[PDB]
Motif scaffolding. Structure first.
Motif, PDB file in Angstrom:
ATOM      1  N   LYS B 233      51.033  32.422  42.754  1.00 50.26           N
ATOM      2  CA  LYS B 233      51.525  33.736  43.170  1.00 50.26           C
ATOM      3  C   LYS B 233      51.707  34.661  41.997  1.00 50.26           C
ATOM      4  N   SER B 236      48.073  37.732  38.406  1.00 46.85           N
ATOM      5  CA  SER B 236      47.888  39.119  38.893  1.00 46.85           C
ATOM      6  C   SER B 236      46.489  39.357  39.435  1.00 46.85           C
ATOM      7  N   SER B 237      45.481  38.910  38.682  1.00 53.60           N
ATOM      8  CA  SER B 237      44.055  39.048  39.047  1.00 53.60           C
ATOM      9  C   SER B 237      43.598  38.154  40.208  1.00 53.60           C
ATOM     10  N   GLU B 238      42.984  38.774  41.211  1.00 53.69           N
ATOM     11  CA  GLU B 238      42.549  38.078  42.390  1.00 53.69           C
ATOM     12  C   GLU B 238      41.384  37.162  42.069  1.00 53.69           C
ATOM     13  N   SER B 239      40.557  37.583  41.100  1.00 54.82           N
ATOM     14  CA  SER B 239      39.394  36.804  40.667  1.00 54.82           C
ATOM     15  C   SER B 239      39.894  35.542  39.959  1.00 54.82           C
ATOM     16  N   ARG B 241      42.887  34.071  40.344  1.00 55.48           N
ATOM     17  CA  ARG B 241      43.400  33.213  41.433  1.00 55.48           C
ATOM     18  C   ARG B 241      42.248  32.540  42.178  1.00 55.48           C
ATOM     19  N   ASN B 242      41.235  33.329  42.534  1.00 50.98           N
ATOM     20  CA  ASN B 242      40.082  32.798  43.246  1.00 50.98           C
ATOM     21  C   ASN B 242      39.334  31.717  42.499  1.00 50.98           C
TER      22      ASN B 242
END
Lengths: 11, 338
Positions: B233, B236-239, B241-242
């Motif tokens: 969580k 910050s970066s969605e990439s 996390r992905n």
């Protein structure tokens, strides 16, 4: 923690 | 009280220094400037004299020069390099162009120490104790070192240590949140570096010698386990996390199996430092109180720093404003006692 060498022949 | 200066060209750079500094001899260095070793006739010690290259070339550099001068003037601790002297040959702000910094001069760094002898567990205790003591001080001024590694640690014959070269080439000691830019990062990126340094002192092997960022992340995640939801969580970066969620899940290894034969108090402290979630990593102050350092820990002799004002980082100024503020700082420098 006592008496260290600073410099030595190698590399 | 302007000293007498003398000018001399060596390696096609002009050096114009007070006559207290004798026997200047080049030792490098790189992008920030050249350095000579010299003999300081006032103090009787050998010193490093750094001439800043092009300190006022752009806004970015003038601000950088001011930042480094502010930081170095502030650091006053046995285990952190301090400024012995700063000077310019300029007689006025008009004419101000060059800046020279003087510090103590490192005999050996920590790599030289490991190269010339086998360290005992007691050496590792004192060395790491001293890093954390330096760090407690740095961190209490809201300064993050960002680049702790063996070659930024000076160590003398008595095994006394000082932290050198703040940021601001070796990535192996870098916390993963900064290596892959996961987030706004905190002081405990430095604790991660101490864990890496201490692990290598104990085993003789670099802990995470990855050949690129991904490879290193895989070495790291293998030891400490893949991130759980709570850490996920906070990325910050969605990439980022992905990419992380595309990894096969991996459990935390048993550090006692990784560091077989090491002092179990050492291994315990390593587990406190090498925690993936930086909010759960032990702090420098807490680490000093760890049973590993019972022979060295003295809570009355572990000082913090005066408050360090960094509101200048937000100022939007002209080159000549950064340069004149830098000049003020050269003018107000007071050397260390006796």
């Amino acid at each position: 923690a006592a008496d260290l060498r600073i410099s030595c022949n190698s590399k | 009280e302007r000293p007498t200066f003398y000018r001399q060209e060596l390696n096609k750079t002009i050096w114009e220094v007070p006559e207290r500094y004798q026997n200047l001899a080049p030792v490098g260095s790189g992008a920030y400037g050249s350095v000579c070793a010299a003999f300081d006739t006032k103090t009787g010690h050998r010193v490093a004299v750094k001439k800043l290259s092009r300190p006022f070339q752009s806004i970015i550099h003038a601000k950088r020069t001011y930042r480094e001068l502010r930081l170095l003037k502030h650091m006053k601790h046995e285990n952190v390099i301090g400024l012995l002297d700063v000077f310019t040959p300029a007689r006025s702000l008009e004419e101000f162009n060059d800046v020279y910094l003087v510090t103590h001069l490192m005999g050996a760094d920590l790599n030289n120490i490991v190269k010339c002898q086998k360290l005992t567990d007691d050496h590792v205790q004192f060395l790491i104790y001293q890093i954390l003591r330096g760090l407690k001080y740095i961190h209490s001024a809201d300064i993050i070192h960002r680049d702790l590694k063996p070659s930024n640690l000076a160590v003398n014959e008595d095994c006394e240590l000082k932290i050198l070269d703040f940021g601001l080439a070796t990535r192996w000691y870098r916390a993963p949140e900064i290596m892959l830019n996961w987030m706004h990062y905190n002081q405990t990126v430095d604790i991660w570096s101490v864990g890496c340094i201490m692990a290598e002192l104990l085993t003789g092997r670099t802990l995470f010698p990855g050949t690129d960022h991904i490879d290193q992340l895989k070495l790291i995640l293998r030891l400490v386990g893949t991130p759980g939801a709570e850490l996920l969580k906070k990325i910050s970066s969605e990439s980022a996390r992905n990419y992380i969620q595309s990894l096969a899940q991996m459990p935390k290894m048993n550090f006692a199996n990784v560091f077989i034969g090491a002092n179990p108090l050492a291994v315990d402290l390593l587990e406190k430092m090498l925690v993936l979630d930086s909010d759960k990593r032990i702090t420098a102050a807490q680490a000093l109180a760890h049973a590993y350092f019972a022979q060295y820990h003295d809570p009355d002799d572990e000082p913090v720093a005066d408050p360090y004002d960094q509101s200048f980082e937000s100022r939007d100024l002209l080159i000549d404003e950064w340069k004149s503020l830098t000049y003020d700082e050269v003018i107000s420098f007071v050397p260390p006692p006796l």
